[PDB]
Structures are given as C-alpha cells and as structure tokens.
Amino acid sequence: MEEYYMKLALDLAKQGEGQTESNPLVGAVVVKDGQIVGMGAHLKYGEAHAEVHAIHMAGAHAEGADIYVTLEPCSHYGKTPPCAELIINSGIKRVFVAMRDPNPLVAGRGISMMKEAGIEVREGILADQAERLNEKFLHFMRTGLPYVTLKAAASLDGKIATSTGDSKWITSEAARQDAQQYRKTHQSILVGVGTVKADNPSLTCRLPNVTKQPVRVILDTVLSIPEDAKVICDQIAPTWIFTTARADEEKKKRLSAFGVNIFTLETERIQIPDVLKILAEEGIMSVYVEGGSAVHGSFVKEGCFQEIIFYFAPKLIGGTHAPSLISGEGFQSMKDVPLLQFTDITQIGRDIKLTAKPT
Amino acid sequence: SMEEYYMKLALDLAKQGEGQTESNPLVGAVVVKDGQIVGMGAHLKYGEAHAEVHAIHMAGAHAEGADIYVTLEPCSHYGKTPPCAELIINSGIKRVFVAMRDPNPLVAGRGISMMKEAGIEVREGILADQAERLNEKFLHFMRTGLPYVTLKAAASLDGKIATSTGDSKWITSEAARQDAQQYRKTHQSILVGVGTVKADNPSLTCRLPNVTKQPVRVILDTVLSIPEDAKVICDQIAPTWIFTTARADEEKKKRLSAFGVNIFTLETERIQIPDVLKILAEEGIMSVYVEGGSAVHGSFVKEGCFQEIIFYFAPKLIGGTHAPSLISGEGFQSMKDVPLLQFTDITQIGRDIKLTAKPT
Amino acid sequence: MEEYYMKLALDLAKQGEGQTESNPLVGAVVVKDGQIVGMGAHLKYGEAHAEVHAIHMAGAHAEGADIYVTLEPCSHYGKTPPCAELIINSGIKRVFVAMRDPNPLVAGRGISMMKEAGIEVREGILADQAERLNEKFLHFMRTGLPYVTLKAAASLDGKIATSTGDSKWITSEAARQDAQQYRKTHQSILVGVGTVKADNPSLTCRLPNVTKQPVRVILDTVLSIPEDAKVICDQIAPTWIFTTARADEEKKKRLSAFGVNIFTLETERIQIPDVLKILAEEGIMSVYVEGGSAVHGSFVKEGCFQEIIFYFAPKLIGGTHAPSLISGEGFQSMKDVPLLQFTDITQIGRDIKLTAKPT
Amino acid sequence: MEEYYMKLALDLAKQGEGQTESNPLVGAVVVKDGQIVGMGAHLKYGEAHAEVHAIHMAGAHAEGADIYVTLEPCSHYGKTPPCAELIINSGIKRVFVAMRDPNPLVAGRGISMMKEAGIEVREGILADQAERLNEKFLHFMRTGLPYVTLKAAASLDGKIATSTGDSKWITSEAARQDAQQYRKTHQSILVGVGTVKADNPSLTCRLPNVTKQPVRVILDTVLSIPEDAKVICDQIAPTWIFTTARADEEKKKRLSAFGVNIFTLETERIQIPDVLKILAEEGIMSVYVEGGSAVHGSFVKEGCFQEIIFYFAPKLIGGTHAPSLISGEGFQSMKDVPLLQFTDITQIGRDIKLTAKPT
Numbered sequence A, C, D: 001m002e003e004y005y006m007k008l009a010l011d012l013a014k015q016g017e018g019q020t021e022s023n024p025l026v027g028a029v030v031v032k033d034g035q036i037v038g039m040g041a042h043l044k045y046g047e048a049h050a051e052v053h054a055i056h057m058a059g060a061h062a063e064g065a066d067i068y069v070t071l072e073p074c075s076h077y078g079k080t081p082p083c084a085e086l087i088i089n090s091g092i093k094r095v096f097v098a099m100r101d102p103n104p105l106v107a108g109r110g111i112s113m114m115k116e117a118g119i120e121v122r123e124g125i126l127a128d129q130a131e132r133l134n135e136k137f138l139h140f141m142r143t144g145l146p147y148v149t150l151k152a153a154a155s156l157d158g159k160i161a162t163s164t165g166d167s168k169w170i171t172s173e174a175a176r177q178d179a180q181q182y183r184k185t186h187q188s189i190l191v192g193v194g195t196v197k198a199d200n201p202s203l204t205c206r207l208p209n210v211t212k213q214p215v216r217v218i219l220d221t222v223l224s225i226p227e228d229a230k231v232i233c234d235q236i237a238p239t240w241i242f243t244t245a246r247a248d249e250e251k252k253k254r255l256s257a258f259g260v261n262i263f264t265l266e267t268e269r270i271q272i273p274d275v276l277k278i279l280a281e282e283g284i285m286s287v288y289v290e291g292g293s294a295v296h297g298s299f300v301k302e303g304c305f306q307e308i309i310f311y312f313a314p315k316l317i318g319g320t321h322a323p324s325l326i327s328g329e330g331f332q333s334m335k336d337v338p339l340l341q342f343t344d345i346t347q348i349g350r351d352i353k354l355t356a357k358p359t
Numbered sequence B: 001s002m003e004e005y006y007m008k009l010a011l012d013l014a015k016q017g018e019g020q021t022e023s024n025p026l027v028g029a030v031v032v033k034d035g036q037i038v039g040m041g042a043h044l045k046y047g048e049a050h051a052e053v054h055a056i057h058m059a060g061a062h063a064e065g066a067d068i069y070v071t072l073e074p075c076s077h078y079g080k081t082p083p084c085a086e087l088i089i090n091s092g093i094k095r096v097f098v099a100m101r102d103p104n105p106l107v108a109g110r111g112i113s114m115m116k117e118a119g120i121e122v123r124e125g126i127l128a129d130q131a132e133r134l135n136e137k138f139l140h141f142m143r144t145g146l147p148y149v150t151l152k153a154a155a156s157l158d159g160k161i162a163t164s165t166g167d168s169k170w171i172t173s174e175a176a177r178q179d180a181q182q183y184r185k186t187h188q189s190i191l192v193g194v195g196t197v198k199a200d201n202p203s204l205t206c207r208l209p210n211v212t213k214q215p216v217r218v219i220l221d222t223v224l225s226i227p228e229d230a231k232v233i234c235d236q237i238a239p240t241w242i243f244t245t246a247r248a249d250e251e252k253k254k255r256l257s258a259f260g261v262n263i264f265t266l267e268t269e270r271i272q273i274p275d276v277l278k279i280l281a282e283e284g285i286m287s288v289y290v291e292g293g294s295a296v297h298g299s300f301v302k303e304g305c306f307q308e309i310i311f312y313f314a315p316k317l318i319g320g321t322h323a324p325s326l327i328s329g330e331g332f333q334s335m336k337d338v339p340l341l342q343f344t345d346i347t348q349i350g351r352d353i354k355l356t357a358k359p360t
C-alpha cells in the first residue's frame, strides 16, 4: 500500500513532464485514515510545489495524516515557507520520501527539518523509478556537470555524408522529426561552428507547443562563425559562443552587440570539460550535442556523455573519404575503448534508432 | 484451410531435406484420398528420388482418384526415368495443388500443361510465399543466373572496423561470431579479399554441429599475394578458389595449384566483381557469403551485387579519422545516387545488435 | 491526445473510490497551452468536487483553458455554486465531457448551462470507461434500484454442498480471496438466514486496507436467526434484517439492543423487489448476494440482478439430494429461460470463475 | 538432435489420426550419416507399418543407419517378418524407441529380439509425448478397460433440463457440432434408456467421411426401450443393449433378430464396471458417455472415467426439481470428493467448454 501511494505520486509527477523546465518532477499524495485526501505534482516552473497542492487539497484532513513525496521536501527558506515547513505546520504525522535531494549540501536537510520536528520519516520507497523520473536533473545536481546527449544520423555503413559532402537524404523526415523531441527536453543545444558554416541551422524547437527555447551553444575555436548566420541574426533564441583568445576582438564586440554571449576560454584550444563546467555554473542542466563529428569525437574521447543516440538509414554510402560518425582522435587500442550498453532500439519510419549509455 | 494444412505439411516435409540435396531445391509432397493422408514425400538426397516418387509410391493404390500437394511444380523433362508430372498422371491423381511454378522461365508451366492436358485439375498459389522462402536462394539463382549474395560485417557502433592502428581484437561478441557462423552453413561459398587472409589467416570453415561438404572458399586477389604460408592453402579442409589477374606470378601460380588449390584468371588488372559472380554461377555455386574487406564489400555495393546486408554493431565507440570503416573504396558521390534499402530485421544478440537489410 | 487527458481524468477519478459514499467518482484536468495545470477528483463525501479541486489548482491558468471532466459538471444551485458555474466564472473556454448526468431531469442541463456562457462543449470521449467507472452508481440512478450481483461457489457439476450439507472445501483459498474483492465494491452483502444457521459467516471484508465494512443484510421470514451468530455479535459491521409480522416482538427488542436494525415487511413472504426498494430508500446502491440457493432463485425469477458470478471447482459431488446452485421455482420451458452473455472467464488457482450478465 | 528426430517421428505419426481405426499411430525416421533418408507413419488400418514405409524410402541407406520409432517395433511372427525383424534385416545399427508395447504380454519382446541381434536399443526419448499420442489406445491395453469420456450440456447453474424435462436446447448449434468430434474419436456412444425414450437419438457421427460408425450402447435395466426408436431401427450403426433379468424373453429375441446385440447382467441394477468389462472384451477401446444424469452419476461414483466434458450455456434454468448434471448417490462427505484438474477452457459460440481429468 505504501507502494501504491508512491507509485500514484510517480504517475502524478509524470504529469508535470516538460512544464517545470529547470525544476524537477515531484509528486505528492496525502493519506488520512486510509483515504487519499490530497494529490499534487509540480506543474509549472516558479510556481507551487507538489506538496503545496497536495496539502491545500488535503484541507484539515492533513492533521495527523501521512504524505508521500517522490523527492525530499524542500527546506529552501525565503520567499515562502519550505514545503518541509508546510508539512509540519499541517500536523503531518509521517512522511514517506523515495529519495533525497541530489544537491550534495541540501541532501538530508529536508528530512532533518521534519525529524527534529518529531515527524517519522521513512525513505527509499520506490527510489528506483523515482530516479528515472528526473534522470538529467539528478545527474546535474550530483555531478555539477550537465547531462549530455550526443545525437547523430548516418547511413547503415556509418557515413554521415558522401565523399563530396552531400547528405541531403540520409535519414527520413520521421527521424529528423523524432530528433526534434530531444530539443525540448534539454536546456541547451550544442554544435560546432562547422555545422553553422555548413548548414546555417536555426537550432530552434519547431514543435508547435513551445514557450522556452533552449540555449544554442556554439564551439567556435577561432571565431569564424558567419556574422549573418541565423543563430546570430534571427534572434529567436539564446546564442552562446565559446572561443579562445584567438578570436578577433572587434568581432566579439560586433556580435555581442546582437546580444550574443561570448565566453573566452583561457586555454588555447577548446576543452569540452571546461565548457561543460561553465554551462553548469551558468545554470544549464542538459545539453543536446547535435553536430560536428569532430565535436562528437571530442565528447566521446573525454567521456563527457551520459547518452548516445544514432539514427541509421537503410542506405549504404561507401567511400574511403566519406565522413564517418565519430571524427577526431579516437582510441588507439580496443583495450581502451569504453564498453557501452544498448538501452533501446526502436524503428522510426524506415530508419533505425539506437541508443546506448556508458559503462 | 484444409488445403493450406496439407501444403503446410508438404512444405514442412520438404525442410527435412534442408541438409543435403546439394543444388536440388527442397521439395515436399502429400497425397490425400477421401480426406485421408495416404502418402508423404520430400526430396531427401541429391540425385535420388523426388518428393512425388516417394509420396506416390507410399500411397499405393490410394493414389487413384486422389489429390496431391507439391510445394514446387512437378518436373517435366525426359531423362533416365519418367518425370513427376507423368508419374502423377499415370497414377490416377485427379487434382494437383502446386504452390509455385518452376524458376527456369524456359521450363515453368511446362509441367502444369502436361497434367492439365491429362485432365488433371491444377490449382496454384497455396502458401506460395512460404514455398518461396523455402528455396529463396535457389529461386534467385535460377531466375537470374546469378549467385545469391549476402554481405555481412561486424563493427563498432560508430561504424568502425578497427582502431586507427588496425586493432580489432575485441570488436564484437562471442555470441555474435557464433551467430555469424550459422551463415557459413546456408551458403555454398565464402568470399574474402586477400587482405583478410594475410590479416588474420582464417580457415573460413563451418564448425556448427553437422556439416557435410564444406562451403567453397573464395579469395579475391590481384597479384596472387596470398601467402603460401597457410590455411586456405595448405589446410586441406575443403576447396579454395583464388581469382587472380595477369600480374600473378607464373612460378608460385602453379606452385599453389599443386595443393589442389584452384586458380582462376581474369583478363583485367582489376578483379571486377560482376565477373567473379558470373564465373561462380558457371561453377554451380548458387550463393556467396562475403565477409571480408571493406573494399571487397564496397565493390559488391557500388556494383549493386547483393541480396542481403547483415551488420553486427557492438556497444562501442572507436572514432578516429583514419579508423577503417564498414565499406570503403569507390562508393557513391551523390546522395540521389544512393540505393534505398529496407531493414528486414532487428535482433539483439548478446551485448550487440544485428541489423539485416535488403534492396528495394 | 484529447483521450489522453480524459483518461488521466478517469484515472484521477479512481483515486476516490470508496470515499464518496453515495456520490460518483469524478476526475477533472485543466489544460491550457498544452500544459496540465490542474488535476482533481472527488475524494470525500460531501466534500469538494473534482472541478472544484482542478480549477483551484489551475489558478490564473484557468483563463482560456480547457478542462476534461468524466461526468457532466453539476448545475443545481445548492450551498455552493454549481461546478458548471465554477467553470464559467473561471474563464475556461472549452469543456470535454465524457457523459451526461444519469438523471433525466438533469442530463445536459449543465452542458447547455456552459454553452450559454459562450463555452465550447464536446461530448462522448471515452464514454464507455466513464460508464464503467461509476457503473453500479449509474445503474442505481437510472433504475432507482441497487446494482445486484449474485455470487456462488459450486462443484463442477453445479453442487453448492453434498447431500449432507457439507460444503467444506468447495472453493480454493484463491477463489474465496478473489471473491472478497466484491465485499469491497458493494455497499451490502446479503444472505438468507439459512446461511447464517449452516455457516454462521461474518460476511465481512478482510482485505488489506478496509476502511468501511459493507452492510450485512439477512432475509429472515420468522426472525429465527440464531441470537449468538457473528452477524449479530461481532459488531464488526452493521447488520440489518428483513422479517414479516410473524417475528417475535421481544426478540426484535433483544436484537435492536445489539445494534441490529430490523425491517418488518407487510407481506407474508419476503419479496426481493420490496427489500431492494427499501435498501434503495436507505441509500444502498449495490448488493452482493452471497446467496442461499433459494435466495438466488428468487433474485433470478424476479430478474433482479445485473451480474452473475459463479466459481466452479474441479470436483464432482453427486447426489440427487445434493443442493444445486439455484433452487426455487425456476423456469418451465427453454423458451422462457432468459439469455445471458458470458462476460468473463478467469482461472483462479485450480478453480474457474465465470461471470455473466443479462440479455 | 537425438530428440529432434523422435519429434519428427511423432509428427509423422499424428498424420494417420482417425485413419487407423483401432490401431495405434506410429511414426519413424531413418537417419544415415546425419541425414534424414526415411520417414513413415501408419496411415491406414491394416496396411503398411511406420517402419515399413521409412525402411523402403531409405532403401540402401538403411544399412548402418539409425531409426527413431515412437512405439516399440512389432515382433509377432505372423504372415510376414515383423518390423523388429525388418529393422534387423536392414542393417540399421541403432534404434530409438520412445515407449514400449502396452501389452504386458509382448511389452519388450521386440526390443529384445533386436538387441539379441547386435542392435543397440535405447528407449525413453520423448516418452511423455509418445504417450499423449495414443492416450485412449494405451489406456485400453494398460487397464483392459475402455477409455471413457463423460460429456454433458447444462445451464450455467448446472441443470440439464427444466423441472418439466424440457431440454429444448440449452447449449447452441455450434456446441452440438463441436461435441460430434467425440462421436468420431470414440468407438462407442453410450446413453441410458431415459435419454432414448425422450430424445429418440441416432447417436451417429454426422461429421465428414465417417467410414465407420461408432457402436451405440444403451443401458436398460428392464429393457423398456421403445421398439420404434431410431437406434433400434434405422440400421445405420450397430446397437448394443445391456439389461438385467427383468427383461422379457421374446422382446430380447425380436430385437436380437433385428441385429441388436443384447447383453444380460445377472445383478439387480446395471453395474458400470461390468459394462466396461464386457465392452472391452468385445474389442471396444473407448466409450463416449453423454447421456443420463443417473448414468453419469454411476460413472462418477465408480470412478470409471478418464475425461469429463461440460458445456455451459449462458443460461439460468432454476428449479429444485430440475435435473442437475450428476445425480446418482454422489459423495456424502466433502473429504471423499475426489480432486480433478481442469485441462482446457474454450468458448464455443455463446457457450463455455470445460474439460477435466482425474487425480
């Protein structure tokens, strides 16, 4: 029964899916005398938390009742009384938490606020799905680095274009279309300058249900990005460029004018780890790395990815000189190439979508 | 439905020939008189009785006024013994259920005609698709004069065949190499470029429990660079045909021919793929399993010489420009010129994923 | 996608099962710009309705929003404004209703009420599920009688006991446990005194969380019930009895003191139509008739049942004097035996549950 | 592999189903140097055996090969060399027998005959499957008694007619047709006179090519069967009647002179063990009992049945004086009621088909 209630809270939590953005998915359910009296979930960013909705709905039935939470109630004092505080102020007898707040220092603080108030706190109830619930958010809080998704599309023989650079029909509209989803479940979209110089993409989420465009990150070592590029001029969404001291001073000035954020790395070449650290320090919790087989290579080589997604088309391109999926340095010996694990393999239209993860 | 049941049986009996019938296609036959099965047959051995002989014999006198289900058109040529359409006619059978006609467009229907001339009802097309899968390759050879080509390869998830240094030790799983082995059993030949011989020195032999008459080994060469050293040469475990060219030495040429090793020679300085298969199609080879060489695979691909693409991806990323890839060589320069295929299968095998695709 | 929401609504309704007493289960979800902004369900008798909870949660987002409701929003003016009104005043622009009110005096009332406010109303999405959800309740309101389920356990040859009355071991523990589910989805459990004499059952619900117990109803023509049976002494659940004028007046007194409520019918034989009418008047909307072969026979003769559930065990009890499933008068010609329709066939343990319905 | 061949044999054997009359189904596979060279089944009564077909087919290859036989090769020295010898004269080195001959008298002779000749014999391969193949036949041999199947059609509450006797069709047309299949797989059909003088049946297998009608056995305590009943007249299928000494002598002569095979029991009531005894003596290996509530009770009380098949119509008949499935004496105490086991549940039209089996 405590299982049902946690499950209930997990399902209630999934209903927030993609509406809380930076904030995580939390589900709350209040039970009094064996009867559900409160149900809630975090449905919007910067608005009422899950416990809030559950307890107001709980009314006076909250007194001496139980409450299930998918994620340790907050103790964030300030503009509002912490949910941990709302929990005791209502007379909640016992609280069931599935997992602690991933933020290192914050972890345990909410449990402690309620225990020292006399409340019996039981944890770990269905921590398993409560983990898959906020996979990226968790990672970002625990590691301090953004959850990274690498996505690429190619032919069945692993080429991403012909030997003349042609790549007009690799994957079907359905794949490109499916790839778009990931552009709304990530705080940022990252690609190299080559992509921009080559395709001049807009990197914006076209799906007819958006209201918070991801940050468009560009790794541009030498700052050769074309100034007229949509990613600078269409000014539809945020655009951040990472260069080095090899950038042209006046140009950075000219671009910043258009409202472009320019980060000058202190190293002479761009190091992915340094870039990721900065994106976290700036509040980015996830990045969808779309292009630059070289960019992908740098990510793969540094072990800077949590998930890999490749779309394969029923087509053989061939070519000694046709560009492959993972460019760059690459591992020298098989005894050193990290073993991944296939997480999913679903067909999308006529192509095949494979997805693997680390270790 | 009862009709489909009997043809199903027929098809299922045929399969017991799966083993040895050599170039002969699998065939089944069942005779039913007054709603009773009275004769079952299948082609079991090369050069021996056809499914109808066995079946018609087993039915004895019940054949008179009976029905018969054959998964393939009854033969109609005149050799050492009477053909099966004649056998059927002579036996009193009233009606024949034929799943599919003959492959040879020069012989197809010739049998239906005979029985039909003899007043036998000939109903066609029952479980024709299953009967088509049954002898899929044989059917292809007869209908194209060309060997059924299957291209298989194992690689990283990012399409690499080895590291930039040539290392390819732990590329795919033992289960995948196991699954691959099956194919050496459904093909008469095993194609592989000379680079592969000197690369790992393979045997290209089938070790799956139960194997008669090993598949013919085929090494594509140019300068007869095949190292006299060993395996496909001084490993008398089966046949080894080596397609070569002019530049092929004169001395060592006959030196290897001494080990029962064959030596074909092409009048070109490039071992054009379509020429090789056509030669094979002459030598009775009806199927080829090419597993060696990105370049060798490239050729078959650019030439459009394949009926099956089978790739094994491991959950590994190798990357590295200068890391060999699945298919190399010429290839297509324009996307509009890339032939679209069709994935016919997705099967997880161990930690790896095996993808199989087919043309248009 | 419309169905996705209605289904969420139907699932939110299920959380209030057995907490609404006589009211139905209602789910409500307020959707705005592709975002779930409010969720609700009726959780407590006489307490807030689904729409009340969903709109409150929805807050300002209610404006121009859409709301899915599983049962027609109420439209009568009681102590608090009806829900239809609650919707009008909140700014909801579109309403998705699964089904209209079961009452003919109310159906569509609220619908028209909302269109009249300029709101767009669509109907019938997932009507079937919305129909099942409150199925018994629905029946009670449309016919004015409680939903009746007849249940029995017999041997494969249709015997409910041997010729000596022995019925020990006719159903497995698995079957008995599965049958217990109905003691939770029904407001009363009814048997004739015969069952009280032979088995002296408690007729209580003994599943995990069992907040409320169903009303135990005994049919006892002469009030010859044993004064020391559980149904009269355990106090675990309400006990009501139906007798005739022949009952001993001092015994009713004695029994009333134990808390038993007695109903004295004006006829000389108990009429199922009568009792059903009285239970309805008391607000009993569902009856789980555990039996007595004769009791079932009457319920069948009168055609006073909506569901038949027999459990058959892999055993043969012979006997000409062995009691069969349904006794009483029964039908004379195969032309008069009403037809049913097998609704389900489930194996539970080594037994096989067969459930069927009329027409 | 060892078992693959034996499976194929079993598969070949199933092909002669229904075409062998009273003979067992048998398959055979000859394997030479890892290749199937012979395959045979026994397809027609009194014709070539399984081994004979396979041995012929295999021809020259038979020498030094193996042979998988689903049933021990015959060893009687009749008017030709039995299969055991035939195997021997063929050079087959090894033999795989799935199960020995059911006849205790011969069981083994064959296996010995071959072994005593240098043949390596191994029995048991897929013995359980080879046992399901000829269930009814094997039972007969192993017990000297007919395999018996009790079949009945009843209402959902277990009645086989109204208290009037009207069985104007409880089960559906689809139901009766499905039941004929049995009149096809059993060598005899049995009903009591009650059934005869109330339905005046033909008890014939009106299915496809019968090529052999089942014996019609009627139980007549006093020989009161109507001398105008279909079974007595119609000369379509044989008809055997069992009676006691209460029957008239002339009546026995009339009927006997019309073909009826009359058997007289020297006991007051007819005793099932005795009828099965007689029937087995007369060759009859199986009997399909579908008639008589009391007749069914007698078979159940004696324990004389290998299979019970009940068709339940979605109908409720009712009535205390309505005939139930199994009457007779039945079991007085539930601790004496034998435990059966459900074997199959299949819906037929609007009716349900339950089949069970002993222990």
Ligand SMILES: Nc1c(/N=C/[C@@H](O)[C@H](O)[C@H](O)COP(=O)(O)O)[nH]c(=O)[nH]c1=O
Pocket: D152, D153, D167, D168, D169, D170, D171, D172, D175, D176, D179, D195, D199, D200, D201, D202, D203, D204, D290, D291, D311
């Ligand atoms: N009453 C029913 C049955 N009744 C079965 C027996 O009582 C009949 O006497 C017997 O099947 C007649 O066989 P016939 O004339 O040779 O076809 N059997 C059924 O399956 N459904 C029934 O509703």
Ligand SMILES: [Zn+2]
Pocket: A049, A050, A051, A073, A074, A075, A082, A083, A084
């Ligand atoms: Zn909070």
Ligand SMILES: [Zn+2]
Pocket: B050, B051, B052, B074, B075, B083, B084, B085
């Ligand atoms: Zn032939």
Ligand SMILES: [Zn+2]
Pocket: C049, C050, C051, C073, C074, C082, C083, C084
């Ligand atoms: Zn309301």
Ligand SMILES: [Zn+2]
Pocket: D049, D050, D051, D073, D074, D082, D083, D084
């Ligand atoms: Zn024999």
